[PDB]
Ligand binder design. Sequence first.
Ligand SMILES: O=C(Nc1ccc(C2=NCCN2)cc1)c1ccc(C(=O)Nc2ccc(-c3ncc[nH]3)cc2)c([N+](=O)[O-])c1
Ligand SMILES: O=C(Nc1ccc(C2=NCCN2)cc1)c1ccc(C(=O)Nc2ccc(-c3ncc[nH]3)cc2)c([N+](=O)[O-])c1
Lengths: 211, 217
Amino acid sequence: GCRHVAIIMDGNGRWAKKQGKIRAFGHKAGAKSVRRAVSFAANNGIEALTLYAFSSLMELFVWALDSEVKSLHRHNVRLRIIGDTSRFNSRLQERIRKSEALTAGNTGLTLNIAANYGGRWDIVQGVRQLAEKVQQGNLQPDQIDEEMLNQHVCMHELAPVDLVIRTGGEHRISNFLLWQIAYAELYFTDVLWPDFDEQDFEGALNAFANR
Amino acid sequence: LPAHGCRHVAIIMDGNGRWAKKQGKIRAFGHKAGAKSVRRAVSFAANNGIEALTLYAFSSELMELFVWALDSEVKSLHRHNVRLRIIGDTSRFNSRLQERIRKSEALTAGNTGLTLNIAANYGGRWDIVQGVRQLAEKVQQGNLQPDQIDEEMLNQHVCMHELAPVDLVIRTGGEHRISNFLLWQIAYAELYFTDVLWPDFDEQDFEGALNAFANRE
Ligand SMILES: O=C(Nc1ccc(C2=NCCN2)cc1)c1ccc(C(=O)Nc2ccc(-c3ncc[nH]3)cc2)c([N+](=O)[O-])c1
Ligand SMILES: O=C(Nc1ccc(C2=NCCN2)cc1)c1ccc(C(=O)Nc2ccc(-c3ncc[nH]3)cc2)c([N+](=O)[O-])c1
């Protein structure tokens, strides 16, 4: 059973170019593909879906999400934004906080949207926290272990990441999740993100089920 | 940079158990064939301009015996101008073994050819945590402020930070996963998975991985 899937959603700009259209067109097709993947995961009992918007700008991508919130809530989706939003404009930060709190109680799919996220950043923010605790004398350097750092990195309340999918044909993690992908299956496909569809997602889930 | 572009390659060497099973042999024959394949890869990397090779002995099918085995290769590595380092938590290793590791490292530290890093009782999470503990000690002595901690600083405290970043990770044996080998250090690395079992992975396979990295960037 695959409980938590993460996807690096690459290929929207390459897709636009192949279609003979401006980069913007590729965003809008990428957004359709977001909806389809979120629906498919919610329909197939996946617990958590973590989406990294990446292209081989982040504010705006989050803005575009703002109008989907009412629909996600109605579908019992818990929405979280992961990543360093602390320099986003304060109006956007308030909307993120409002959407997360609206849905925080939902018990269906948890959808994590990584915004201005980096795996090294995620670890460093958790290390900064431990460092504050040591300085305040609340923690001995030496009590620090994997389990404790794990509690200070993103998504520690969710099932571990079982499967990472990257569309778009590159074979890297690109500083998406690092700590959390120690034991995840890595599935790379040349399909571009706007084309990735239910059969492609099932293909990735077979890879997991075979292993 | 060599034409392939790769300064540091890391290899998850899986498949030795499977290879021995396919032949009707016990696991020890797979380990001896896997050792032949290490010598061959080390020789290939050294002849191909690679700066650093990092090897993670892993079977999908103890750690301390692997490192005893390596102790018998140290003279030969030295003779081939290889600089040898062990990465991993060896602090609970047999006291004799820890002294043999130290001396093999000191013996070859002057070498100018390939740098070979052998992971022994290594895990990517462990490596991040030991880096974090060195930082927390500096905070507890009043030398470091929590707010001065950034990526660059934590980078300076994980294994291999003084070598070229890892450009390419090869995993043999058919599984598509990192299995808690390098994690901080592979943020930008090319990942190359091949179904070839470790004992069968030969120069043409290694050339093929390098040229796939060169072609993909
Ligand atoms: O990325 C999105 N929108 C978007 C639009 C435009 C752009 C854009 N960039 C600049 C040019 N256009 C970017 C992103 C997007 C779209 C739909 C959705 C979304 O999931 N909608 C949605 C609504 C309902 C359901 C659903 N159905 C069953 C259970 N859940 C599933 C999905 C999300 N999302 O995360 O939720 C983001
Ligand atoms: O893993 C190794 N040996 C080994 C043997 C047995 C076992 C074993 N485990 C349980 C059963 N037996 C495990 C490991 C091994 C073998 C050779 C080497 C090795 O690289 N030796 C070497 C020696 C010489 C040269 C060389 N010299 C000049 C041309 N090239 C190149 C490489 C290494 N190594 O890390 O360097 C490990």
